[PDB]
Subunit: 147 residues, 8 copies
């Protein structure tokens, strides 16, 4: 389970990763000592996995994002595509999926011509066919819901 | 504008969004005041969009994730869909996309029966057909790359 | 849970629904009294739902079977298609599904021309579009696996 | 040949596969000996293929069901697939089908991670691509109709 | 009923629809009166549906042939489409079909521009979307087989 | 070209293959001598290719018809699929096509199980993958239009 | 027809639009007077339609090109989509097509976000659904072949 | 670099590729020497890629145009296809593309039979499957836009 003070803690940290032990103690109703305990334990148990600023990809030069659906070409070989593409830094996310493809990647790249290159690199390195869906706009991203 | 100092700062914040200004200052070769100032500008421009604790979706009860591709029943109407689905809390992300669908959603839910009720809700509020792809495993996600 | 005498009981009843309390007591290792207890309780709790002979559909005049995928046309209306088609006797099975369609039916019919009629009946009664996949041959059906 | 007595018997056995011969006899207007004889013939012809307890898949730990459509990587080879997948126990049903896929499987499994490993197994043993459709709910199933 | 004499007659008429009764009689071992009588019955039952000269479509100016698969814009309505398209003379054949489309048409036309105007006509009179597949060559057609 | 007495001749023979030189001379406006000339020349030049009675396929035991789209698997081999399947008598028609497939066949068969067999025979003999579309009903077939 | 001096003229002008009446007279084998005649007549008759420099689209700020397939939503309305989109300057080309869509456009735009906007403008102005295919790279374009 | 003078020049050359330097000079407010110099630089940079007479494809005997989408039979191989098809003269354009296919070709040909032979050639030289979409009409094309 998860007591609903740990739920108020995770709610508030999902919405503001830089919120201080201080201002959390007001809204939650504990002490700067007791708050800091719960948080460190939330992280010990893999409930909060880390803290990140959310960087706009366009600002840092990633003008084209895509979903890339991939399917291993040779079923007699071990299916290790995620581990094989792990070193490719333009792959942001890798999920296995129940659909037509075996995996979906989210990929970010400087331009359409850089995507073409990345696709070929993905195909020759993991040994897969690719089908990509270009993203035109993010309306919102990672709004984590804590029930 | 995005200089070498700014690149350093966005890197460090992507990797650790609770990094204190003092830690950031010594890593950038700056004073804490100059750091805080740079960081405020990153935030006011579009570059840093927020900070969030990365929460484990399974630990808070979201045992089933899915991509949902959606297509408007009447695409001639100017398109409402992201604003209308904004109020459904189990929608985590919304992207518009090229190809057959108009948008892809990432959605998270307690179970199979909750997925089916969520899909009815999405069909009705956005006036859309849905195509769903269940996520079986997340190998890695949100690995932001600053070039 | 389920103790692994109840597991040997369910294994053996999945494979032979007409097996007698007698011959079950040998293989399982109980008494004709103790076996009959476990079974009646397996049925009380919804573990065994019933007993059926497996009828060949072709023998009884059902020469064409199909999967029929259906999608409600109007998302402003309640989605009650399964309850609406419940009285149609040629629908053997109805599942909701995460894919392109909302439901998949398994349907059995006398001929291709009777399928055309059934499809129109399905469309006008539930208020859905249909996409059907014709079955050419059953290799095996309902081999229940008890882990 | 399928007379009115035989139709009665197959009906009663579809609805209750543990019906005793005496119950069957009085419902068909026959002696127990004539009943038993008719029933043996139904079994020896292709008409009654077996008897099974209908077991609740969730009660024995099969929390995830799926349709899997499969297409041979090399369709020129005469096709092996049903015999090869026969030894995978989580495959419950196998149908050959017209349209884009060659066969549809109904499959049952403990979880999402078990589904993904099962799909690798199916791709490799049958030499096939897979397309998966997760079942969210079974509204009704196996409702056999004798016209 | 379709005896060995009837099979002979339908064979000969499929291969030569202007065969005279006398020729037919000596091939069937019958009198001309018995022949004429058998043939009338084939016609009155559903077995022989008409006689036609096989005309070369290119010789009469039909330089472009196409399959057109059609799907109703509103499939809940009971379906009109064959009766409505019956009055378009360039529609040669109309079949209802299982799968994604509802009907397939074979259509013949003078040219590319005439095809495009025909497709607008089909979309509007039947209220359908169209999917077109141009025929490049007819290798053989109408080779009727009597088993 | 084709004079519009030859057009009235072809119109009337498309509609009635058994029409006599006699009754054609009335409607057309020639003599039993002059009619018979034009017809024999229409056949000399490949304008009328033959005469056929139109046999109902269901009457002769062909209860299932399909379109079968086929694509050669090996582009290094000559593409002779039509000539290879020419001896298979259940293929009524063979067209090359501009679409996803290279050819479309119309095929007629006794049952769903006979189609499965035919499909495998097609695949192993020509060296192709198959995708089939089952026909549920013919509304009208070969209505030849003479402009 | 087209004499094969007019063919050498069109061959050479397809390859070099700025070639002078002078250097054309050598290769072709005429006089600076006779060359200039043929060309002006080639243009009079709509054989050469104009002369254009081939501008690199990326150089002028068009970093994303797409094919956009469009289908009119309402078949009761006149189908005038090409004339309706004629004033939209980012549509470079408009073809009617025999396939799933009614028209294919080639479109050029500054970015993925500008494509999203253009797509909505296309949909609301002509009254159509859109399906787009993003171009990643042009290998060669408009190599006109003169047989 | 692309200044206001350069924009003027590329505009005028897109609209009339045989414009003489003197005409260009007075339109740009420059000397003929400065014009010629600017134009040489546009050519040497990547901006003006060539000049071509726009030839009417139907006037030189290309009565049938098509898009052909192509997908490699083995996508793991680094991809050859544009260089290999470069030597087929009826291929006018070649684009790589995102989505299901890898490239789209625009192709032009004398007739239907020539299309079918061209498609065999494309399948074999590039080792690809093909999907063809016939163009029925070109409403306008090559309308280059300089923003």
């Amino acid at each position: 389970a998860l007591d609903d003070i740990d739920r108020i803690l995770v709610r508030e940290l999902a919405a503001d990763g830089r919120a201080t032990l201080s201002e959390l103690a007001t809204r939650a109703g504990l002490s700067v000592s007791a708050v800091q305990s719960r948080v460190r334990r939330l992280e010990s148990r893999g409930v909060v996995q880390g803290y990140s600023a959310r960087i706009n990809p366009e600002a840092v030069g990633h003008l084209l994002s895509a979903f890339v659906a991939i399917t291993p070409l040779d079923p007699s070989q071990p299916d290790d595509a995620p581990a094989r593409l792990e070193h490719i830094e333009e792959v942001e996310s890798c999920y296995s999926v129940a659909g037509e493809a075996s995996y979906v990647l989210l990929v970010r790249v400087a331009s359409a011509r850089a995507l073409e290159d990345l696709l070929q690199r993905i195909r020759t390195t993991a040994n897969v066919r690719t089908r990509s869906t270009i993203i035109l706009n993010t309306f919102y991203s990672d709004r984590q819901h804590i029930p």
